[PDB]
Structures are given as C-alpha cells and as structure tokens.
Amino acid sequence: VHLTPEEKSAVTALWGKVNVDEVGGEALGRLLVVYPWTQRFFESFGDLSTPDAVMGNPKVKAHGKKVLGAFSDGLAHLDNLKGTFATLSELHCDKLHVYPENFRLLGNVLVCVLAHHFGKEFTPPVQAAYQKVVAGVANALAHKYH
Amino acid sequence: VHLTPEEKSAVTALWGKVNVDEVGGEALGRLLVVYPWTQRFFESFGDLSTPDAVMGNPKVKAHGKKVLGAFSDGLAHLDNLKGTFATLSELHCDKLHVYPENFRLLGNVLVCVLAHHFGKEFTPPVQAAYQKVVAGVANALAHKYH
Amino acid sequence: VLSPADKTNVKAAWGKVGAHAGEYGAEALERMFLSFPTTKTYFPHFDLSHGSAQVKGHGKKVADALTNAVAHVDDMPNALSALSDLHAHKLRVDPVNFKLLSHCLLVTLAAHLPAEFTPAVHASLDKFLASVSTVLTSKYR
Amino acid sequence: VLSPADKTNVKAAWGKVGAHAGEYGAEALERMFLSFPTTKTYFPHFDLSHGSAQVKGHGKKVADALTNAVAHVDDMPNALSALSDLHAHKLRVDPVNFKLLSHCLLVTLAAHLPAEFTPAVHASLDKFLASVSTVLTSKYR
Numbered sequence: 001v002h003l004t005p006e007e008k009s010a011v012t013a014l015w016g017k018v019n020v021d022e023v024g025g026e027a028l029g030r031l032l033v034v035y036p037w038t039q040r041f042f043e044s045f046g047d048l049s050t051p052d053a054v055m056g057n058p059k060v061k062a063h064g065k066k067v068l069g070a071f072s073d074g075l076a077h078l079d080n081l082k083g084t085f086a087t088l089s090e091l092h093c094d095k096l097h098v099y100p101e102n103f104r105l106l107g108n109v110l111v112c113v114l115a116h117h118f119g120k121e122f123t124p125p126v127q128a129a130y131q132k133v134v135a136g137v138a139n140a141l142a143h144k145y146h
Numbered sequence: 147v148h149l150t151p152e153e154k155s156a157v158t159a160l161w162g163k164v165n166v167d168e169v170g171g172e173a174l175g176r177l178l179v180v181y182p183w184t185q186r187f188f189e190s191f192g193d194l195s196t197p198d199a200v201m202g203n204p205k206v207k208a209h210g211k212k213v214l215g216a217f218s219d220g221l222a223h224l225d226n227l228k229g230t231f232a233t234l235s236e237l238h239c240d241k242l243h244v245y246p247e248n249f250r251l252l253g254n255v256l257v258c259v260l261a262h263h264f265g266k267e268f269t270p271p272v273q274a275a276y277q278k279v280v281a282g283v284a285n286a287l288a289h290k291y292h
Numbered sequence: 293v294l295s296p297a298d299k300t301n302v303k304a305a306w307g308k309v310g311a312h313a314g315e316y317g318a319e320a321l322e323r324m325f326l327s328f329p330t331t332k333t334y335f336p337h338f339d340l341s342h343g344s345a346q347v348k349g350h351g352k353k354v355a356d357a358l359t360n361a362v363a364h365v366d367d368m369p370n371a372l373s374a375l376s377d378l379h380a381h382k383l384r385v386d387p388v389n390f391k392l393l394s395h396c397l398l399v400t401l402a403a404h405l406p407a408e409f410t411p412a413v414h415a416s417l418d419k420f421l422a423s424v425s426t427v428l429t430s431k432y433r
Numbered sequence: 434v435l436s437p438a439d440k441t442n443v444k445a446a447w448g449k450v451g452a453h454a455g456e457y458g459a460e461a462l463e464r465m466f467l468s469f470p471t472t473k474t475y476f477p478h479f480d481l482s483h484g485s486a487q488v489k490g491h492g493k494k495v496a497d498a499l500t501n502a503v504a505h506v507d508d509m510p511n512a513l514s515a516l517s518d519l520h521a522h523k524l525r526v527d528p529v530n531f532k533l534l535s536h537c538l539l540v541t542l543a544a545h546l547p548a549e550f551t552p553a554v555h556a557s558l559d560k561f562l563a564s565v566s567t568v569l570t571s572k573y574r
C-alpha cells in the first residue's frame with residue numbers, strides 16, 4: 001500500500017457507496033461458483049450444488065459480510081495491513097490451510113463485483129488503486145505462511 | 147526454515163556431494179527449456195533456440211554457477227534467509243521484474259536436478275527437507291515485492 | 293473443457309457485446325497497463341496513454357481474435373494456431389500475463405453488461421478465456 | 434498443446450518406465466505427502482505411512498490412469514472423463530495440488546531414469562502432466 005492522494009480519494013469515494021450487506025456475499029458467492037474447488041471449504045454451508053443455490057444461501061451472504069468487514073478494516077489500515085490481518089492469516093494459514101492463491105482470486109472477484117456494481121464509475125485508474133489494496137490484503141493474509 | 151536435526155543432516159549431507167560447477171547450469175538450463183517464457187530474461191546469453199544450444203551455452207553454465215552460490219549461501223543461513231537475499235531480491239524484484247512464481251519453478255527444477263543426480267539417495271524425506279529450503283529462498287527473493 | 297452450457301453462455305454474452313467488442317478490448321488493455329504495469333514491458337513502441345489510438349487499434353485486434361475463438365470454440369487450437377506462435381514463440385509472453393489480461397477482460401465485461409454478467413456467465417467467460425490463454429501459450433507446452 | 438515431439442517423448446519415457454509404473458506412482462504420492470503435508474488432507478482414511486499398502490495400491494491406480502492418458506493422449510478429455518468428475522466434482526481437489534503431484538511425479542521419474550530424463554523429455558513430461566491436470570480439474574472450468 002502506497003495509494004496516492006488521488007488513488008486514496010478513488011478508493012475511499014467508492015467504498016463509501018459499497019452496499020456492505022450484499023457485496024461481500026456477491027463476491028464470496030462468485031468465488032464458489034467460479035472457483036468451485038474453493039467450495040471444499042464451505043461444506044457446512046449447505047446446498048451449493050447450483051450457482052442459484054449458491055447465490056441465495058444465507059450462510060454465504062452471512063459470511064460474505066464478515067469478509068467485507070476485514071476489507072473495510074484493511075482499506076483504512078493500509079499502514080499496517082500485516083498488523084490488522086495477523087489473526088485472520090493465522091486462521092486461513094495454519095487452521096484452514098487455504099492456498100494463498102485463493103486469496104488472490106477472492107480479491108479479483110471482489111474487483112469484478114465492484115466493477116459490476118459501479119459500471120463506468122469503476123474506471124481503469126480506480127481499478128488500479130483497487131488492484132493495489134486487494135493484493136496488499138491477500139499478501140497480508142498469506143503472511144503467516146512464512 | 148526450521149529443518150530438524152535430521153532434516154539438516156539430510157540437506158547438508160547432500161549439498162556436500164553436489165557438483166557446484168555443473169548443477170547450477172543443469173538447473174538454470176532446464177528452467178529455460180521447461181519454462182521457455184523465462185528465456186525472455188537471457189536474450190543476451192546467445193543461442194537458446196534448442197535445448198542442446200541451451201545446455202551447452204557457456205553463459206548459462208556460467209550463470210547457473212552464481213545461482214548455486216546464493217543457494218550455498220542461504221543453505222547455510224536459514225536463520226536469516228531474508229537478510230541474506232535482500233540485495234538479490236532487489237535485483238529481481240524492481241530491477242529485473244521477474245515474477246516471483248519463476249522463483250518457485252527454479253526451485254522445483256533444482257529439486258529435479260538433485261533428484262536426477264543422486265537417484266535413490268534423494269529419498270522423499272530429504273526431498274521434503276529440500277522443498278522447505280527451496281521455498282524459503284523463493285520467499286526471501288520475492289520479499290521485496292512487498 | 294467448456295460444456296454445452298459454457299458454450300451457450302460465451303456465445304450469449306458476446307452476442308450481447310456486439311460492435312462494442314473492439315471498444316471493450318481496448319479498455320481491457322488500458323486497465324491492464326495501469327493495474328499491471330509490468331505488462332507494459334511488451335508494448336514499448338506503443339503510446340500507452342489514455343486515448344492512444346495505438347492501444348485503440350490493438351483492442352480491436354484482441355477483440356477480433358476473441359470473436360474468432362467464440363466462433364470456433366470447438367476448434368480453438370487450429371483457430372489460434374498463428375497467435376500461439378506470435379505470443380509463445382516470437383513474443384515469449386509470460387503465461388501469467390494471460391491471467392492478468394483475462395482479468396481485465398472480465399472486469400470490462402462486468403462494467404458494461406450488468407444485465408448479462410451473471411455468476412454463471414462470469415464462470416463460463418473465465419473458463420473460455422483460460423482456454424484461449426492455454427492455446428496462446430501452448431507452444432510453451 | 435503437446436506436439437508430435439512431446440507425444441513422442443511421453444511415449445518414450447513411459448515405454449522406459451514399464452512395470453515399475455505402479456511402483457513409481459506410489460513413491461510419487463509418498464513424496465507428495467511428506468513434502469506437501471496439506472495434501473494429506475484428502476486421504477484421511479489412508480495409512481500414509483512409509484510402507485502403507487494403501488498408498489501402495491493407490492500408486493498403481495494413479496499410475497494406470499497416467500498410462501491411460503499416454504495411450505489416448507490425443508483424446509485425454511474423453512479418456513479421463515470419469516476421473517475429472519471424481520476429482521473436480523466429488524472430491525473438489527484444489528487445482529494447486531495437481532501442480533504438487535506432477536512435481537513429485539517428475540522428481541520420481543528423474544530419480545529413476547537418469548538416462549532418459551533429458552531436458553527435452555523433462556519438458557514434455559511436464560507439458561503432458563499439465564494436460565492431465567487441466568482435464569482432471571476442467572469441471573471447475
């Protein structure tokens with residue numbers, strides 16, 4: 001994380017609009033649908049046999065919400081992204097054993113969901129600002145793999 | 147890097163036998179041949195249009211030797227593998243812009259090259275000790291990407 | 293892979309894309325160059341600036357190559373034969389860059405067709421793009 | 434991809450492998466489980482110990498599946514149809530594990546056939562194994 005004043009203004013101004021109730025679920029959902037292997041991790045979530053069954057699962061939308069929190073957390077903590085995520089890293093690292101590349105996927109799908117929700121307002125430049133944050137988080141996450 | 151006494155004994159006992167003149171080239175060579183995209187980085191090395199032209203290039207075998215050095219270096223500095231590699235990381239990170247994943251492939255091919263030279267003496271357990279080390283180096287390397 | 297279903301989706305979304313195909317392919321690169329600056333290393337003789345007509349005309353190129361894929365999806369290999377050579381052999385493009393490109397392509401798709409960019413369509417696009425990428429890097433393989 | 438060259442190589446090394454095919458398939462898993470202990474997560478009802486006859490018998494299974502690929506390399510998809518289901522759908526194996534396995538497979542190939550494990554053959558095996566993996570996970574795609 002660096003995020004130039006311009007970039008920061010872009011990131012901040014966007015997350016401000018973000019529907020926190022439903023974007024996290026939108027992104028978590030899409031990860032399960034796009035990267036189906038990742039579903040081996042939410043077997044206790046219920047019926048995930050169909051993307052429909054995936055997109056309308058209350059657990060998914062319930063979980064997707066905690067996921068955005070951590071993001072809101074980090075988005076305003078670029079300073080110490082590693083500090084912020086120590087605990088989470090630990091959970092996913094030597095507790096969940098989630099391959100760090102999944103961390104990237106999520107990030108990217110989060111990028112698509114944003115792009116999905118903001119349309120034209122999600123310009124390349126804002127995208128790039130977001131690419132930075134997303135990868136910082138994913139890097140903060142797989143930190144405990146060291 | 148942890149490497150149990152047993153593991154360490156395995157690692158050390160192996161590297162001891164390692165022909166430093168020719169293994170580094172053997173591994174660097176195989177990297178260019180197996181992952182040809184990687185050749186985009188050694189355009190100044192000469193003729194690399196055939197594996198033969200690759201495996202018999204003096205600069206490749208010349209270069210492959212410095213690479214083993216860094217490994218001998220690290221192999222005996224698992225304590226501070228990030229310390230040892232700061233300068234190298236810097237060259238490859240914001241000087242060469244070599245995608246960290248290539249750090250992994252090299253490591254892997256290094257594993258096969260060892261496996262190739264020691265045969266049965268490269269048991270699963272020693273392999274595992276080496277997988278640890280190889281990944282430590284690769285991670286020390288892509289450290290400056292943060 | 294690419295199932296009768298995927299096949300349907302890809303042909304659907306694109307149907308939808310229409311003549312803006314070229315318009316999107318350029319947005320994609322643009323997005324790529326800014327988000328993944330390292331990729332910029334392949335277009336040194338390109339004006340990578342915002343309205344660059346260079347990037348503009350390349351987008352159509354790519355865009356058209358993707359159109360060729362969709363229509364010949366059941367024969368990508370033979371279809372992209374030439375392109376694999378250019379990219380793998382002649383260009384020696386790092387396979388990773390295809391992952392970055394595909395991403396921006398998706399992002400672009402999403403930014404313009406909120407209607408059709410369903411979770412199921414999203415998946416089929418991603419699958420399709422990976423196929424394209426694999427062939428275009430198949431000479432490495 | 435897999436060129437007429439690749440195809441030649443794969444068929445050559447394997448020819449070389451012979452009856453020890455199964456023997457190597459098991460050494461491969463063993464190496465995987467020790468080097469990548471996270472993989473062990475999938476064989477919880479397996480005795481993952483040294484001489485495990487379970488691991489032993491699986492190696493032939495894997496080994497035979499690879500032989501089936503080689504002989505049908507021009508139609509992997511249809512060939513491994515079943516296996517893709519098992520692994521992608523039913524087991525939901527992380528695609529990454531395929532990279533890990535194939536690595537150990539190579540490592541085993543190399544530790545046994547120093548004579549035929551040329552840089553050229555190494556490349557063709559790698560390419561081949563990537564093919565198998567892509568099919569085995571193409572239901573995710």
Ligand code: HEM
Nearest residue numbers: 038039041042066067070071096098102103106107137138
């Ligand atoms: C930036 C990426 C990610 C972030 C920020 C994130 C965040 C979180 C959060 C906030 C929780 C729950 C906290 C709690 O229990 O109090 C969690 C748990 C979990 N994460 Fe993630 N996650 C990420 C990526 C992933 C990926 C890629 C996977 C793999 C499929 C994954 C799998 C899980 C699972 C299965 C749980 C549930 C733990 C349990 O309830 O036992 N996460 N993560």
Ligand code: HEM
Nearest residue numbers: 184185187188212213216217242244248249252253283284
């Ligand atoms: C285990 C991973 C690696 C190690 C330990 C390593 C080590 C080294 C060393 C020791 C040098 C030169 C040292 C000196 O000048 O004193 C070097 C330079 C170089 N490395 Fe690597 N390397 C690794 C991976 C890679 C990869 C994956 C690539 C990409 C194909 C790469 C490309 C290069 C190039 C092109 C140079 C030459 C720089 C120049 O002379 O301008 N290296 N590396």
Ligand code: HEM
Nearest residue numbers: 331334335353354357358375383385389390391393424425
């Ligand atoms: C779906 C993915 C891609 C498609 C369909 C595609 C398509 C094309 C096409 C059609 C051309 C020009 C062919 C002609 O002469 O008509 C081209 C050129 C090129 N591509 Fe791609 N490409 C893709 C991905 C990439 C990626 C990921 C990179 C690297 C970041 C890349 C780098 C290049 C470069 C450097 C050129 C040559 C530009 C010039 O000198 O004119 N391409 N590509």
Ligand code: HEM
Nearest residue numbers: 472475476494495498499519524526530531534565566569
């Ligand atoms: C491309 C390489 C691979 C091949 C050819 C292969 C082949 C096979 C075969 C033939 C079976 C037995 C199916 C049956 O007859 O019911 C099997 C089962 C299985 N495979 Fe693999 N496999 C490969 C890679 C992997 C990887 C990378 C993993 C993940 C660690 C994995 C995990 C499993 C598991 C957990 C089973 C089920 C065993 C049981 O419950 O009895 N496989 N595989």
